[PDB]
Amino acid sequence: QEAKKVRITVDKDPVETSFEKWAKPGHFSRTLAKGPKTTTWIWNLHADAHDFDGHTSSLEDVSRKIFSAHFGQLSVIFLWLSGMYFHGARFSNYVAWLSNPTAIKPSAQVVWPIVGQDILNGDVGGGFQGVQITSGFFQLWRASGITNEKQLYATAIGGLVMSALMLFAGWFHYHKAAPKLEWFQNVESMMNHHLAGLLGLGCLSWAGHQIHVSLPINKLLDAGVAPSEIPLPHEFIVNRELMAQLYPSFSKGLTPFFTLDWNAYSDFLTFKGGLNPITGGLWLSDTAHHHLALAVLFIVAGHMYRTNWGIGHSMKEILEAHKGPFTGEGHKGLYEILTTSWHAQLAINLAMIGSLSIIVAHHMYAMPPYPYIATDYPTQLSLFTHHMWIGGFCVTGAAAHGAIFMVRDYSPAQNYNNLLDRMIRHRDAIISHLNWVCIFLGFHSFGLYIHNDTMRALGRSQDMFSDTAIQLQPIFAQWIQSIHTLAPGNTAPNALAATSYAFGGDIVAVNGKIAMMPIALGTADFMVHHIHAFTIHVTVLILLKGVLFARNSRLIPDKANLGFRFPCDGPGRGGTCQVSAWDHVFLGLFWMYNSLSIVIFHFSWKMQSDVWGSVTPNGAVSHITGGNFAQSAITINGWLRDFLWAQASQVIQSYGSALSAYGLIFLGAHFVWAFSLMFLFSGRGYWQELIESIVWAHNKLKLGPAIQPRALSITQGRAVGLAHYLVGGIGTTWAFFLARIIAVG
Amino acid sequence: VAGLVPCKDSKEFSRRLDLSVKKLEQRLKKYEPGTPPYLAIQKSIETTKIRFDRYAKGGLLCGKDGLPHLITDGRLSHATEFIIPGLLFLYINGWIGWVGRAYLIAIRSSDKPAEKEIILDIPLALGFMSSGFLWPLSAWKEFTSGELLVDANEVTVS
Amino acid sequence: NNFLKYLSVMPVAGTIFMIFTAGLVIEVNRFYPDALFF
Amino acid sequence: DFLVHHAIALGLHTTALILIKGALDARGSKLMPDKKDFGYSFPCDGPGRGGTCDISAWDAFYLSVFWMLNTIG
Amino acid sequence: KRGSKVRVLRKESYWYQEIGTVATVDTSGIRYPVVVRFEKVNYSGVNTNNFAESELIE
Amino acid sequence: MATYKVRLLSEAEGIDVTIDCADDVYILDAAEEQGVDLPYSCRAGACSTCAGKVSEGTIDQSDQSFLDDDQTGAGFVLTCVAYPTSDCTILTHQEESLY
Amino acid sequence: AHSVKVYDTCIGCTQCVRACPCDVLEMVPWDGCKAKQIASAPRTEDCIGCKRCETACPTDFLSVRVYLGGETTRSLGLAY
Amino acid sequence: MPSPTFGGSTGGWLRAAETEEKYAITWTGKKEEIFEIPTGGAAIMREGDNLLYLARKEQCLALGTQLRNSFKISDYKIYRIFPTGEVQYLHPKDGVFPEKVNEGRVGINNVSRNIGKNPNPISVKFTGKS
């Protein structure tokens, strides 16, 4: 039993906060504590900075290094959030933006006029000059209902003091009072408070902020009241009857909620759905209804697990009883896996918080949450693409530490015939059927794009795959849009408007600019979604080969004895170049950019052709690129001509304007991208012999360093060609996306 | 002269004065006088005019495209365009080239020289710093003393 | 010792020198902009 | 046209740089003093002594066709 | 020769024409009877070496 | 150059000596300076033949490259990078004892 | 069909036989240094050429040269 | 020298059709330990003598090296099974590990010079030498 063994077990004053280990670096390992005889020591100082399992075998002081370092991470978020709210105060036009947010551009950066760099401060209206900016805090602060300039100045000084508490908390949990491993292995209580007292109260108190503040502000903003003439947020609390003049349910009080007459609160907790045509966004009373819906059953889902007081589903027992006929012993052993190694826990946490942020990017463009974000097509493009790439980067880290756990913390004595062992036993049939389907998909997705490109080149346009050709109609994806337009009335009978206007229904347009149009999925989207199904399958072809062949293979039967990150096992067996599980992540990261650039290119052409544009008061709709995705999207030359060559004209004809900083980054990240391939195509032994000429040029002149100037190591040399490629593969997509949509829209 | 025409009297160079301030005054007529974005443009108007009076009195040599050009045929009349920028450049390039060599001899006669290259001896690094405005009369003395160059039978070689 | 000798590590002794030697070039471009010569 | 010949003369000296390294370090070095006993076109010397990818004079040739096409491009 | 610094004469090592530091000269008829140490460590991370008595110049 | 004492003992051959060393001198260099033969390969910290076991004492063994973290957790010190910073008693001939 | 001949420096630092995962290196007692042993290579037909001796080899430069020549299905490491 | 015994496991990643070389790493244990098969998975390790058929000799040595470090036993023997059925007794080669110094000295592939003392490849012209 653990009838008093969920308690706190805290060491008092473990580490003296001193200065002598603070200035003698490399102090976390035996191989780095004896000075830099070589220049591998400087690059090993940064690579072993967060490799805590190579520092101590004691898991108690490993897990105290994790918990204090999260406070250092969370203090960086509050310092960065203070930089957003302070630049809304002293360096912004947001207080001028609220009087007319339909045509005044957002601005949160005034550049110092120094080198003649003042031309980037553009005429963004409001009597204000500055850089046009696209992170979308301005529609967030209208969604929360910050009206005046003082509340942004108070939050950033309220956020800086929240960082100074959060930075102090990591100091207290490594130098005065540190928990033990008994406290960290109480995971049946950690999922209780995180479900209930983090996300439930994180919703329920936020539902308090939305009902009492953001709903009376955004009911008075869209009526046409100036933001100087709206009553204050502490007048919608101490005066109940002022809320009663907006929603008449507040004249009654708390008695419908306590006595369960909850249909009396329908006037401000509704199920409208769809959009709000006055302010250009989601119905805020739906969002105020959505948060306490999640709150009242996250706290219900909080009390699921076993705690101090007897009741609760034990996490060791629900896992153990899931055995089956095919699955051998079931999950017998996985609970001791996840409460010992953090890398096993990080490999599941990164796939979730990665692929929840891809859900964020898809559940934001077609359901615009924030008011007056619907007309601002630059903010929809930047908030899509940034939530893609974080969900693209954090998903390859799930197979980073999925492979780091296998070589370090996977003991096969504790894993006889359980569920993790059985896929190491049949790891040929996992990869080979994944190896077949990528050749099946890439012939059937990219091979059609060649086949439409040849038939246009060979003259015979009646032999490609188009609407006026051999049609490949996406009949499954065209069907579910016809279901969600019957989701009002029929299938969900209390939903008045649609669940989203992307599936169908009606257009919504705000001040002429189109808020949301129905997306008509045609035969050019059967192929580009199959592109997306292909290149996702290749990324899990490299990465699941990295996890299942992390221990051993038929090339190397003792791969885990060399470590996780090693270059090779010699040029024998024909050559073992890039054989580690590190290089599978290094190979798998490249196809992610070869995946996610296509997803944001499918975004930036379809939404520039079918939904965004202009609406005449008769009802005539004229889009930006004229709806050229019906024909020109089906060929690789059409992706080159009508999208890559054509939409980059706003980037490169933008010198002398305020978008001219983006043209420098557009040439900046062609350069860093073709700085990568020096680090990527070449080897090490060339440059080490090339450095060998230069050490002669210094030892002739008494100029040689006492440290040894070496070439970069091979995993280090593959890593610097990796990070350069993903700066120069993303930064020019960044500088072409932002420069196009600010210019044309 | 020396090829093309001077830009002290050049119609295309004076046209680049004309349409640039005509472009920049078009931004001025959408604001109101007294605002801080109005003063940010009008101060940026005069720093383009005085720039166009800097190159006129400087005697730059260009024409046929309205730009300024530079001459690096060793011309002493054109010494202000490349030579005395390079003579200040090569002056205290040769600080860092010499005091890095001066730092790397006294650090070799130490107990642990490997740690001392990234853990600085700041009273020695500044102690070998300010003897760097007077480098090349001492570096030439170092070249003819003999120990600036070690002998070829004691170097590292393949 | 050992805190001013923490301000002798080559990045941080570089960076407070790099804060200095960047800003030497910035503030001479404050008072003398637009210089092709002298 | 002043500046762009220096883009050619960058690529003229750099494609010379890989290959005068590629000629004169086919025999030996400090990283491999017995490169002559292995031949012109061998893969590597392994991961030992720091790692030795692209050590051969064939792989010292191999980098210049990138720089040759960069230069004549 | 005990003690002091001894320069090398053989090629194919990392330390060629370097300073050297001799230690414990061997007397058994072994081909390489000095186990001379060095600073300025090699590619293998080994600051020591043994070679023969034909490469001293001191 | 301080003074330190190391009591070496090899029970397979049966030799127990007390040698004197300094902070810069290695342990087997002091064993060769008192006339005691000891196994070694190249005096680098990068072999297995020169392994001794620290029975009592404190040894700066940190300049080696052969032995890993756990294999030195039992107290196996190569005698050729060892700076004896204490007065110790060391069991030697432990070259098979590490592996 | 490689050729993994061992040179004359050859101090008997018995870890190349330890680092060989194919048992193609084997110590032979031989008149020489205080270790009194040399590294011999009998199984050159059985080797893979994965160069695991050379990474653990603290001589001047490489007591066990490896230099890769011929090959077979054993040396190429195929399980089929 | 071989004998019919077992190993005790389950697996699905092993030798294919292979008939040029196989073997049997045979050893005596001491307990029901759980060990990683070098092609993957786990096994149960019956306390008497037991054997493993695997494909190629890297898997055979890396199971013999893994058995020496964890649950230390210096008694593993390695054969080689031909397609015709002949045995070889490959690995210890005469009753002992090769890191121990033998008394039977063959001494082959032992050049008697330094590695710089090797001729130029012009001197080995149209023939086979270093």
Ligand code: CLA
């Ligand atoms: C209901 C109580 C509660 C709350 C709110 C949290 C909240 C958090 N925990 Mg936590 N935890 C709890 C109970 C709670 N825990 C218990 C009972 C245990 C033991 C079983 C743990 C064990 C635990 C571990 C081991 C770790 C966390 C981590 C985290 C952070 C996750 C980051 C995040 O989601 O961003 C959301 C961020 C915020 C909402 C920021 C605001 C946070 C404010 C200050 C509330 C903090 C409440 C705190 C529990 C009060 C402590 C009392 C103290 C004043 C004396 C977050 C701050 C992780 C972390 O980041 O470490 C710091 C981590 O590694 N917790």
Ligand code: CLA
């Ligand atoms: C939850 C987030 C998270 C956390 C905590 C870790 C934690 C860890 N990872 Mg990991 N990883 C993650 C996400 C995460 N990773 C993701 C998402 C990926 C896929 C991209 C990887 C891929 C990965 C690999 C491949 C490896 C690790 C390793 C490690 C370990 C040491 C890391 C270290 O010292 O780096 C120190 C910090 C740095 C080196 C910072 C470098 C900064 C990079 C280059 C980005 C900079 C770009 C910049 C932001 C923008 C441009 C700048 C401009 C100048 C152009 C540690 C356990 C390594 C290890 O040894 O594991 C045990 C290892 O081999 N991880």
Ligand code: CLA
């Ligand atoms: C544009 C360049 C390019 C191309 C076409 C490929 C092609 C491929 N890569 Mg690949 N790759 C590339 C760059 C490229 N790579 C780069 C830069 C890297 C480094 C990051 C990698 C790293 C990499 C990995 C790590 C993996 C692949 C994989 C694959 C295969 C995916 C399956 C597929 O679509 O096959 C179908 C083939 C095509 C679509 C090619 C076009 C063929 C057309 C459609 C028809 C054929 C023409 C003609 C009719 C043939 C007959 C005539 C001919 C005989 C003369 C495929 C062979 C995966 C793999 O090998 O397993 C599947 C895998 O895991 N790649």
Ligand code: CLA
């Ligand atoms: C556009 C991509 C690119 C770039 C810039 C370079 C750059 C260089 N290569 Mg290279 N290379 C490339 C691609 C590239 N390569 C490819 C694809 C290959 C084929 C594999 C090679 C193969 C190759 C070989 C084989 C050789 C070179 C050599 C060189 C150097 C030439 C000397 C020179 O120009 O000095 C000037 C340096 C540069 C132009 C590099 C960029 C410097 C930047 C712009 C300034 C410094 C950065 C600055 C501080 C910015 C701030 C950064 C911020 C994070 C703080 C230089 C480092 C030669 C060499 O190293 O000789 C000395 C050589 O032998 N390269």
Ligand code: CLA
């Ligand atoms: C003490 C500083 C110092 C000195 C005097 C030299 C001197 C020289 N280097 Mg050199 N170099 C240095 C540092 C230094 N280097 C560093 C740190 C690197 C690594 C980035 C290199 C990389 C390097 C290469 C790759 C090459 C040279 C070459 C040369 C020679 C020609 C001059 C040239 O173009 O410079 C080259 C200068 C650079 C590429 C950049 C300068 C590097 C830094 C910024 C200077 C160090 C500043 C340091 C903080 C000073 C400390 C003083 C104080 C703070 C205590 C010349 C002998 C070339 C050669 O062999 O010609 C014969 C050549 O190809 N160097």
Ligand SMILES: CC1=C(C/C=C(\C)CCC[C@H](C)CCC[C@H](C)CCCC(C)C)C(=O)c2ccccc2C1=O
């Ligand atoms: C060029 C190249 C090198 C050589 C690159 C080197 C040696 C890096 C040199 C640049 C470093 C980063 C300079 C660091 C200097 C410090 C910043 C100090 C400078 C002084 C001030 C800025 C403080 C490799 O080592 C390599 C390895 C593997 C594959 C490809 C390659 C490769 O292409």
Ligand code: SF4
């Ligand atoms: S370095 Fe590159 S080439 Fe040389 S061995 Fe390791 S992988 Fe093979």
Ligand code: SF4
């Ligand atoms: S590796 Fe070098 S040193 Fe160790 S034994 Fe073989 S030859 Fe002698």
Ligand code: SF4
């Ligand atoms: S050749 Fe390959 S196998 Fe034979 S020893 Fe050297 S590394 Fe080990």
Ligand code: FES
């Ligand atoms: S004797 Fe070879 S490493 Fe110490």
